[PDB]
Amino acid sequence: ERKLTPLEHITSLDLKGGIGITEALRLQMEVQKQLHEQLEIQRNLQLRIEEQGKYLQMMFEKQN
Amino acid sequence: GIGITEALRLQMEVQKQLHEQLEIQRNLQLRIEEQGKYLQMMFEKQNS
Amino acid sequence: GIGITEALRLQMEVQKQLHEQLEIQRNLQLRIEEQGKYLQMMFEKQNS
Amino acid sequence: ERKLTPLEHITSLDLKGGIGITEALRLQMEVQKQLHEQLEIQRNLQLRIEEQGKYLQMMFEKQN
Ligand SMILES: [Mg+2]
Ligand SMILES: [Mg+2]
């Protein structure tokens, strides 16, 4: 729901003034920061999932 | 190993981090769309 | 460098791969929930 | 919309038969395969985003 700011929203009026390219580059930094963040959550997820795996496997073998 | 309690905490944390990626991915997708129409407006300028 | 055409293709590919993560993340989240209630049923057995 | 199969859906009747743990471990393999897939798309996304970045920056400097 975090909607675009005017600095992020590329309008036709922005193009008639020649700032569409700079607004597109602004989006580039933000997008690429949000890939890094969502990548960092990936590594965290993969680490939290991996320890549930150890816990569940350690109990499966308690039955055995 | 880890307790049953710690196992539920990891469980609660995993669910919220999934919800967090969903929200980040919705934001990131909204911004990819803007670059989409910019490229299109510059492409559609290129044809005409 | 890359053409304007290749730039639009990367654009179209990025949007679909985002849509694909959304669908994978919805599947993965549904399965995390099942482990959630299993742990809870085993936890709620542990109290009683 | 890819809903759980009965092999994936852990019921109370599964617990009364002692197969909840194995179904939970089945979920573990699938979840962890889907983290790897969503991680692989991350790397692909980060690489496709990075080349739009080069293209947009190379045009910003053409104006200059
Ligand atoms: Mg604007
Ligand atoms: Mg079942």
UniProtKB/Swiss-Prot annotation, chains B, C:
Family statement drawn from the similarity comment of this UniProt entry: Belongs to the MYB-CC family.
Cellular compartments annotated: Nucleus
Modifications made to the protein after synthesis: Sumoylated by SIZ1. Sumoylation controls phosphate deficiency responses.
Record function comment: Transcription factor involved in phosphate starvation signaling. Binds as a dimer to P1BS, an imperfect palindromic sequence 5'-GNATATNC-3', to promote the expression of inorganic phosphate (Pi) starvation-responsive genes. SPX1 is a competitive inhibitor of this DNA-binding. PHR1 binding to its targets is low Pi-dependent. Regulates the expression of miR399. Regulates the expression of IPS1 (At3g09922), a non-coding RNA that mimics the target of miR399 to block the cleavage of PHO2 under Pi-deficient conditions.
Subunit structure: Homodimers and heterodimers. Interacts with SPX1 in a Pi-dependent manner. Does not interact with PHL2 or PHL3.
Superkingdom, natural source: Eukaryota
Segments carrying motif LHEQLE: 18-23
Disruption phenotype annotation: Strongly reduced shoot growth, and slightly increased root growth. Reduced expression of phosphate starvation-induced (PSI) genes, decreased cellular inorganic phosphate (Pi) content and shoot-to-root ratio, and impaired anthocyanin accumulation.
Name of the protein in question: Protein PHOSPHATE STARVATION RESPONSE 1
Induction: Only moderately up-regulated by Pi starvation.
Coiled-coil ranges (or none): 5-25
Organism per entry: Arabidopsis thaliana
Coverage span on the entire protein: 310 to 357 of 409
